[PDB]
Amino acid sequence: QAVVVAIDAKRVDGEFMVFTYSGKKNTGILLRDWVVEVEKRGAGEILLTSIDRDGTKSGYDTEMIRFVRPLTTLPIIASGGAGKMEHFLEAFLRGADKVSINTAAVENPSLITQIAQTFG
Amino acid sequence: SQAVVVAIDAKRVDGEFMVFTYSGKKNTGILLRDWVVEVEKRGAGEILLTSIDRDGTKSGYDTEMIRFVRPLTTLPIIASGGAGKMEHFLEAFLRGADKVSINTAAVENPSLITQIAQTF
Secondary structure (H helix, E strand, O other): OOEEEEEEEEEEOOEEEEEEOOOOEEEEEEHHHHHHHHHHHOOOEEEEEEOOOOOOOOOOOHHHHHHHHHHOOOOEEEEOOOOOHHHHHHHHHOOOOEEEEOHHHHHOOHHHHHHHHHHO | OOOEEEEEEEEOOOOOOEEEEHHHHEEEEEEHHHHHHHHHHOOOOEEEEEEOOOOOOOOOOOHHHHHHHHHHOOOOEEEEOOOOOHHHHHHHHHOOOOEEEEOHHHHHOOHHHHHHHOOO
């Protein structure tokens, strides 16, 4: 799956909207529509980031993950918001095939080990 | 453990690569060439390597950062940031990226997905 389409999204007026330019611009296209179209186009895997939660070690947007899961057969990488161990677990339970970590890993590198050791 | 991605957001300075957190915002101290090593040690499955300086520009992936990071690690590397046209992907694979990620240019020309995907 060498082709990854990265989708930055967050709720705009209750709705999940797609952003581009480092999360600065609302494309006006709905998450829903974009996920479907990207698979049709030949995406091999989806990196799904919640813009809201990035850098807030407050957990992935699991509603976002749940809402995307039935829309695609592709592998999904959940990114944005990971703060601690149960977040990974919640993301995975929701349909995420892989979970990403940045901020918390640079701070607590033993988090990498904790989730790795547990999934294997 | 395949299930664990560590995302590294990086940009140059002084001639040297640093690591930022909190949405590319808070520069960190750490050198990339040392974070990439530690991330493998700690057990990550895969690295999302994003060039902060290229993201949103459709001006090409940072192939120096890639060609750079590649000898430091056996993990697969997803290059991200800057994808703009078909030769960009090719250049990134040639520098040793295992996967390539696109966002801004894909939303604008969803056929970019199809170009790289059908060649694989």
